[PDB]
Amino acid sequence: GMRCNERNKKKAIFGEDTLMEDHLQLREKLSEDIEMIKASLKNNLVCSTLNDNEILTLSNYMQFFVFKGGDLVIKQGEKGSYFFIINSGKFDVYVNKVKSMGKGSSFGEAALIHNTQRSATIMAETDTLWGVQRSTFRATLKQLSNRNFNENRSFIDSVSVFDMLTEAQKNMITNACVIQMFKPGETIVKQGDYGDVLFILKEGKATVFINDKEIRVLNKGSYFGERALLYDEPRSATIIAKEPTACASICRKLLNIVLGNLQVVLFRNIMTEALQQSEIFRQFSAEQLNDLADTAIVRDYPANYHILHKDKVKSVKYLIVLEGKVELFLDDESIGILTRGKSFGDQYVLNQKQKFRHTVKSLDVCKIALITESCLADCLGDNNIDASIDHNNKKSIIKKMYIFRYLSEQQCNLLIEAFRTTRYEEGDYIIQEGEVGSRFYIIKNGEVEVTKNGKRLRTLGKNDYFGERALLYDEPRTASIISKATSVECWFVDKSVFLQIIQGPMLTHLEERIKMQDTKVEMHELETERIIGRGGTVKLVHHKPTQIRYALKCVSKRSIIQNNIKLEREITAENDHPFIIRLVRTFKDSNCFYFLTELVTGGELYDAIRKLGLLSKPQAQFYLGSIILAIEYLHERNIVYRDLKPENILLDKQGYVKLIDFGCAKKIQGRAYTLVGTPHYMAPEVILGKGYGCTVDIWALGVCLYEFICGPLPFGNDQEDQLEIFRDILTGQLTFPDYVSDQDSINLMKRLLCRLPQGRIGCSINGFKDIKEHAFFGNFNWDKLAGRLLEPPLVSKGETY
Amino acid sequence: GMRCNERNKKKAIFGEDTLMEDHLQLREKLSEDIEMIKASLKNNLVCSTLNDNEILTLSNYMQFFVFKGGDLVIKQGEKGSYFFIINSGKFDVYVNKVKSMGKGSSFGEAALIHNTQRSATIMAETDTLWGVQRSTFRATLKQLSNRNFNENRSFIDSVSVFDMLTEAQKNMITNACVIQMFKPGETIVKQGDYGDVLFILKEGKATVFINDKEIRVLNKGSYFGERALLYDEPRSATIIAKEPTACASICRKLLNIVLGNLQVVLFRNIMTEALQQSEIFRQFSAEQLNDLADTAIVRDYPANYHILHKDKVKSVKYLIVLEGKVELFLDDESIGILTRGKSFGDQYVLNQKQKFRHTVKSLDVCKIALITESCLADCLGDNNIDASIDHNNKKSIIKKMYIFRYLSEQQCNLLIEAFRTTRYEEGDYIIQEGEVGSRFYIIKNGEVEVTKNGKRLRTLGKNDYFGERALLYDEPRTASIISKATSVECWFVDKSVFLQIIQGPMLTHLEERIKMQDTKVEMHELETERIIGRGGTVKLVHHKPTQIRYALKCVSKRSIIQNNIKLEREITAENDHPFIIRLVRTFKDSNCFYFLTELVTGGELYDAIRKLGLLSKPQAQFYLGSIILAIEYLHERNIVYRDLKPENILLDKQGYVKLIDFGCAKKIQGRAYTLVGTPHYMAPEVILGKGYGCTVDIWALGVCLYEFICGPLPFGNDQEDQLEIFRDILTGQLTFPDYVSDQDSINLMKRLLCRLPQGRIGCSINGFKDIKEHAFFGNFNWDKLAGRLLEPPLVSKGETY
């Protein structure tokens, strides 16, 4: 017998949920059971706002548990996971005896939300329970809502009137779908009624009656009413349900709340897609394009018509085909045919004064959008269009750069206006490596090469830029830039001009940030100093080569109980906003993870408000406005923060804020369901378990504002119990103290603390713009905030921790 | 607004199972579905041996999953948890495409056993599945079997004929219960049939017919046939089932396999309970008492009879009342009345030659057990009863001491016979602290005090012992022992006499063990040396004060993923057997757990057998015999080892074994269900999931013996796949190579590797005695093994690792 000798070839294999399977038993649900269940659930803080289909599904997941006398169910110490509705016998309760429960009552509702440590201890006096486990319960809620969402979404996709909505806009109105049930013989819509609702058959069938005469029958997927979302019209038919039926419905009143005017939205989308085929309008902003959409002259034309001929329509600069075909001519030569969505006019858009030489002639019946000299001027803010488009093209390039992006509008404009132009010949060194630069460049025409030590590094072309560091530092150029084309033209600005425009506090912020960011740093180059945080642990460290001081968070590797650290690091590294903590580098070893970030020395906002007391309006504008810019930045990158509270915001030494703890943040993909956050700040929709997005961060804004202005928290303020906090959030009353005298503040607080997201301000199509334009922010200059041109409420004297 | 300022009062909240809930959907099970399921399950390696009630319950737990075309189900990398039976459509398979499956087939059976990494990747070509998750599946199997066990147990408890069975004996026959189903109108037993089966109604009803005439009707709990387990009798009635019924049944043939002769067993239990009321027989062994039970004269007597009178029945020494009452007299004085279970005769049992002075007279009709001079002599092994009881009382005391417990029987007897007696007066120092002792003492009569530095420590009385260390060492007495009574008498033995009896290798084993055990050791007193194991890590350490070398296992605290370490430490500390590793102390700190144990220097048995090749019979007797003593010791303490294999056994420097890895060991409370172990060694019943006990260690004995004698493993020998190993274990063929020429070896191997535990040798009432008495062990002296009086197969030259 040969034996295997590879010694390590054979490898060995190694709460309430445990005890409750002892009592589980199959049991058919009779009507008496089902109705008691529905009765119990309709009174549960989580299920009270559910329809009958939802509550029924939940019911069929309940399980039967039988007990004999003297048996235990829950215990005062153990962590809870089950929720029970009593079905027979009596059950005694014993915190630290207290009561007795029988047929109909329920207990352990807190476990339906989180792993709450039990309080009492329920035991069976007599000798059954309907029960359900948290995981099963929340998984069921997730699946119910998620499938409802996905189904309604695809039904939205099949309704032609929504075809030109963007992805984001489609998802927003999917959330507005209401489900209506129709018993057989019920009339869904009646002929001649000026209704405003679109119906989709999700399940069932219905019959169509025109003048009391059967005209056809409708099946799942059939839909009707799409014109009633755009116009005041009478129903063309009477529709009556044969079978019980399921209808996804969208109302126009809700559409207008979620989207505004559907026709206006669809046309912006269409026009924006057309305009962006042009290299010119591709430099315009979304708002600028929307404005051009809102003012374009739309005309229908017969075939063989001269829409534009030489000097005939003198004001038109650009032409977009919406439907049909037109042919372009220069004099007698056809130069092309434009179909649906294509356009013409780049030449005339750029040169306001140039006479239209071309001819446009319809080939068939068509519909045309015309952009005139006045639309352009109105879109841009003045009559000098040529100059204003050049100005705006330069604005577009620098508004993408951190350094220029957050300057006030007047500062930005002054810089654009200071730009000079110069030209180079091929092989000219625009910049020589090693020399001390004082200029910033933007390539207007041509191409250049980036080279260091003879070795090429990159090529740069039109609208590319280089050299910006010379605006902030006195230092040698690290690379040469060489004209790699005939007649390269550059726009440029001098450091001296920049320093006349940017002011001290912004300059200081940029100076310290770029340097710190780009500096290479190694662990052994780092000298620890004093400690400034225990929990992981955070030390004030000191870069030996540069003397630049940083902060270093040390996260014990033993704390890796999980996967989210890989995800937190991803998010934390990508963040590049003035009001969000800037990560420098991440280090790792045997025992500990490391985060190297900028050092923030002004303390927590949690302490600043307790030192200020109750914030005046200007002071609450400042901090809430700051938080709003940070949160808006994250949402644009589809990141939900999920743990907004004053504790998680630091003040830098100039008194501007920095958001810092990204432990609970997440890149959202559709709806999120995980229960995460700090209870006093959590949104109703997180607790209720039917899905949420980025807009939970907006609810927390409201909580914060309320603390700023009113003082205490708005819900669960003197509550310790996690469950009682959630209950006050879900159904408690929101009130304001009598010393709050600002109606606009109260309006804003009430609208940020709106429980259904669809009614929550800042949660519809305009996003944060509805918050920024609220009358609470009336006298507030959002422009000066990001640019550090405002006096902050509180500036630290020296460092604070 | 006062705000809460306690900064840390608010605290934030933080595979296949995930994707499959996307596809879950409620679905009523129609007959077509249920029958396909049952069909699929009856062909599954786990469920093939289940009855219809079991398979039905499993079926109702299956869940419906719907898929559209192109959807994924399992993926080649992911860890598996689901098992699927296809219900519609076709599903493609792709390891690293390979096949296509449709209506009826199943996949993912390996996950029904363990967290097996998937291999293929099944995806839906067309556009349903019946599915079940491992946890749910095994939880269901556990509950089915556990409730069946518990119910049958309580039915056993209600059957009067089993009343006098011990706890262990009741549980053993519960496992023998067979469930039989009876359709309405079926006859369970027919009048006049010489049946041998006991029936219990677990559920249903039945009707009793005597001479074709209805005599009564039976309900759940009613039982019949208890005399048919003890005697050849005809059924008194005909019993026919009205309703479908559930019967727990016990056959006499199985009873005899599991227990032997029920009447013999019940009477041993009864007699043992009676005899142990006497201080004399309480010193006898279980076997000695059973023998007295097997030979006692049982008699029935009329009332007013003289059972014993003076010299009338000269041979009787002891009397036990089984039923009824008798009265005791000394001459004409009544001295008491004995009822059921009480007894009389201590005086005459001790003094063989003393004439019976008493009179025993029945008060009513009674049944009496009589123990005669011949039963005593036969029980003890010779005619000199007085001496033999004294000898046996001394044997009882020292057989409880490690030092004497494992000596051969002849050695033990020689020691007992060398005992001398001495007497003390009150306040005499039997032992003076500080002096060098050479004697071992057993208190025959009286009391003594243990004192150190004047301060008393303890009192010791009859049958207590002290001083045993002076037999092994030359050292000062650490305490004084003082006669704290009038005329204390002691038995004692001299070191010189002990050293003439115990031989070198045993003496060396005891010398090294007691010293090492009792030595106090601190971490800083320990000097590391060479390393001898990587994984935790094990170092050869060196006690500075004593020069005693130990082994120190260092278990990284980061490896604490759990709770079982608290349990392993408990078990490892309690173990006190020569063939099990002896723990000294446990140490702990910030980064690591510590185990300080004896050092074992002869290497693994895994390597000894590969050096010996195929073991001769004497060599396999030696090692298997050694393992058996260790395993038997653990089972007596209700510990199941669960990971027996040659890897986990070390050889000490004398070539005797030591069991070492207690990671998988567990103190059993009823049945165990957790799947734990090394696959090639795991028992069928562990895999099948319907519960197991200590007897899985006996299956592994068989695996080991097979490797010893045959060479390769008996199942899954060249298999890598965990699933294919289990399948060969569950249903593969056991064969033996043609060069195995020992029929007794094969018989033993086949009987240790019996798949149903009830047929497995060593698994019935006699326990390991059936293995020790197997003809394979015919020429083997179990006595000399534990006492180290056998030449081992292999002795190391110097240390090995």
Residues of B with a Cβ under 8 Å from any A Cβ are 1-5, 7, 10-14, 21-22, 24, 26, 57, 60, 114, 139, 142-143, 558, 606, 609-610, 614, 643, 645, 647, 663-664, 675-680, 707, 710-713, 737
Reduced to 3 states (helix: H, G, I; strand: E, B; else coil), residue B22 is coil
CB B515 within 8 A of CB B531: no
- Structural element, H or E, at residue A569: helix A564-574
Query: Residue A609: closest CA among chain B residues belongs to which residue?
Result: B3
What residues of B form the annotated binding site? Answer: 99, 108-109, 111, 118-119, 458, 467-468, 470, 477-478, 532-538, 553
Q: Region of B579 please: left (phi>0), alpha (psi -120 to 50) or beta.
A: alpha
Does the residue B457 lie in any domain?
yes
* Cβ within 8 Å, pair A647-B7: yes
Query: Residue A643: closest CA among chain B residues belongs to which residue?
Result: B12
| Apex B446 CA angle, B442 and B447, nearest 5 | 85
Distance from CA of B133 to the nearest CA of A (A): 14
Give the integer Cα–Cα distance in Å for B484 and B481: 9
Place of tokens 């709460």: A15
Query: Residue B146: closest CA among chain A residues belongs to which residue?
Result: A22
| DSSP letter string, A187-204 | EEE-TT----EEEEEEEE
Distance from CA of B683 to the nearest CA of A (A): 13
Q: Which residues contact A96 (CB under 8 A, 6 or more apart)?
A: A76
Do B649 and B780 share a domain, yes or no?
yes
* Reported resolution, Å: 2.4
Residue A311: exposure state from Cβ atoms within 10 A (0-12, 13-18, ≥19): exposed
Do B60 and B121 share a domain, yes or no?
yes
Do B376 and B309 share a domain, yes or no?
yes
Dump strand ranges (E) for A535-591: 537-543, 549-556, 583-588
Residues of A with a Cβ under 8 Å from any B Cβ are 1-5, 7, 10-14, 21-22, 24, 26, 57, 60, 114, 139, 142-143, 558, 606, 609-610, 614, 643, 645, 647, 663-664, 675-680, 707, 710-713, 737
CB atoms within 10 A of CB B171: 16
Does the residue B68 lie in any domain?
yes
Give the integer Cα–Cα distance in Å for B402 and B404: 6
What's the one-letter identity of residue B12?
A
Residue A460 structural domain: 388-513
**CATH number of the domain where residue B732 is located:** 1.10.510.10
**CATH number of the domain where residue B509 is located:** 2.60.120.10
* Cβ within 8 Å, pair B663-A12: yes
Torsion from C-alpha of A452, A456, A460, A461, nearest 10 degrees: 130
Adjacent-strand bridge partners of B249: B178, B199
- B343-355 burial, b for 16+ CB within 10 Å, e for fewer? bbbeebbeebeee
Residue A553 main-chain phi, psi, to 5 deg: -85, 125
Give the integer Cα–Cα distance in Å for B76 and A181: 44
As for chain B, the residues directly before each break of C–N over 2.5 Å are: 14, 96, 127, 535, 561
CB A408 within 8 A of CB A321: no
- Structural element, H or E, at residue B391: helix B385-398
Residues of B in contact with A710 (CB under 8 A): 1
Mutate to test the interface with A, among B14, B62, B706 (most CBs of A within 10 A): B14
Does the residue B244 lie in any domain?
yes
Dump strand ranges (E) for A563-636: 583-588, 592-597
Torsion from C-alpha of B22, B23, B25, B28, nearest 10 degrees: -160
Residues of B in contact with A677 (CB under 8 A): 12-13
* Cβ within 8 Å, pair A645-B10: yes
Query: Residue B608: closest CA among chain A residues belongs to which residue?
Result: A5
Do A777 and A628 share a domain, yes or no?
yes
Establish, for the pair of chains A and B, how many residue pairs have beta carbons separated by less than 8 Å: 93
Q: Which pair of tokens denotes residue B197? A: 């089966």
Residue B629: exposure state from Cβ atoms within 10 A (0-12, 13-18, ≥19): buried
Last residue of a domain, one of B84, B118, B141: B141
What's chain B's Rg over C-alpha atoms? 33
Do A607 and A722 share a domain, yes or no?
yes
Spacing of C-alpha A130 from chain mean position: 40
Give the integer Cα–Cα distance in Å for A624 and B594: 55
* Cβ within 8 Å, pair A7-B606: yes
Q: How was this structure determined?
A: X-ray
What residues of B form the annotated binding site for 3',5'-cyclic GMP? Answer: 99, 108-109, 111, 118-119, 458, 467-468, 470, 477-478
CB B706 within 8 A of CB B615: no
CB B579 within 8 A of CB B656: yes
- B477-499 burial, b for 16+ CB within 10 Å, e for fewer? bebbbbbbbeebbbbbbebebbe
Please tell me what DSSP assigns to residue B111. Answer: G
Query: Residue B8: closest CA among chain A residues belongs to which residue?
Result: A647
* Cβ within 8 Å, pair A614-B1: yes
For A1, the closest of B675, B679, B711 (CB atoms) is: B711
Adjacent-strand bridge partners of B538: B533, B553
Place of tokens 């009556």: A240
Does the residue B680 lie in any domain?
yes
Give the integer Cα–Cα distance in Å for A237 and A227: 13
Give the integer Cα–Cα distance in Å for A620 and A264: 35
Distance from CA of A7 to the nearest CA of B (A): 8
What residues of A form the annotated binding site for 3',5'-cyclic GMP? Answer: 99, 108-109, 111, 118-119, 458, 467-468, 470, 477-478
* Cβ within 8 Å, pair B3-A643: no
| Residue A390 falls in the annotated catalytic set | no
Reduced to 3 states (helix: H, G, I; strand: E, B; else coil), residue B472 is coil
- Residue in B291, B643, B697, B728 annotated catalytic: B643
Do A484 and A556 share a domain, yes or no?
no
For B12, the closest of A664, A710, A711 (CB atoms) is: A664
Do B572 and B676 share a domain, yes or no?
no
Residues of B in contact with A1 (CB under 8 A): 614, 707, 710-712, 737
Give the integer Cα–Cα distance in Å for B438 and B422: 15
Does the residue B200 lie in any domain?
yes
Give the integer Cα–Cα distance in Å for B484 and B459: 8
Residues of B in contact with A610 (CB under 8 A): 3, 5
CA distances from A284 to A241, A276, A385, B96 (A): 50, 9, 13, 50
Residue B321 main-chain phi, psi, to 5 deg: -85, 120
Give the integer Cα–Cα distance in Å for B482 and B452: 11
Give the integer Cα–Cα distance in Å for A175 and A785: 34
Do B279 and B307 share a domain, yes or no?
yes
Q: Which pair of tokens denotes residue A94? A: 């014993």
CB atoms within 10 A of CB A447: 17
Distance from CA of A722 to the nearest CA of B (A): 10
Does the residue A24 lie in any domain?
yes
CB atoms within 10 A of CB A77: 10
Last residue of a domain, one of B247, B262, B277: B262
For B643, the closest of A12, A21, A678 (CB atoms) is: A12
Residues of A in contact with B21 (CB under 8 A): 139, 142-143
Residue A134 main-chain phi, psi, to 5 deg: -55, -50
Do B344 and B407 share a domain, yes or no?
no
For B143, the closest of A21, A679, A712 (CB atoms) is: A21
Distance from CA of A71 to the nearest CA of B (A): 16
Number of domains chain A contains:
6
CB A684 within 8 A of CB A731: no
* Cβ within 8 Å, pair A21-B139: yes
**No. of helices (H) and no. of strands (E), chain B:** 24, 38
Does the residue A800 lie in any domain?
no
Do A718 and A731 share a domain, yes or no?
yes
Place of tokens 């004896």: B598
Please tell me what DSSP assigns to residue B680. Answer: G
Last residue of a domain, one of A141, A174, A192: A141
Residues of B in contact with A675 (CB under 8 A): 13
Closest to A366 (Cα-Cα) out of A426, A325, A420, A408: A325
For A3, the closest of B13, B114, B707 (CB atoms) is: B707
Does the residue B207 lie in any domain?
yes
Residue B534: exposure state from Cβ atoms within 10 A (0-12, 13-18, ≥19): exposed
Give the integer Cα–Cα distance in Å for A34 and B162: 45
Do A316 and A397 share a domain, yes or no?
no
Q: Which pair of tokens denotes residue B296? A: 């006692």
CB atoms within 10 A of CB A279: 10
* Cβ within 8 Å, pair A2-B139: no
Q: Which residues contact B80 (CB under 8 A, 6 or more apart)?
A: B16, B74, B108, B110, B111, B115, B116, B117, B118
Closest to B466 (Cα-Cα) out of B500, B495, B431, B434: B431
Residue A468: exposure state from Cβ atoms within 10 A (0-12, 13-18, ≥19): buried
**CATH number of the domain where residue B524 is located:** 3.30.200.20
Do B492 and B619 share a domain, yes or no?
no
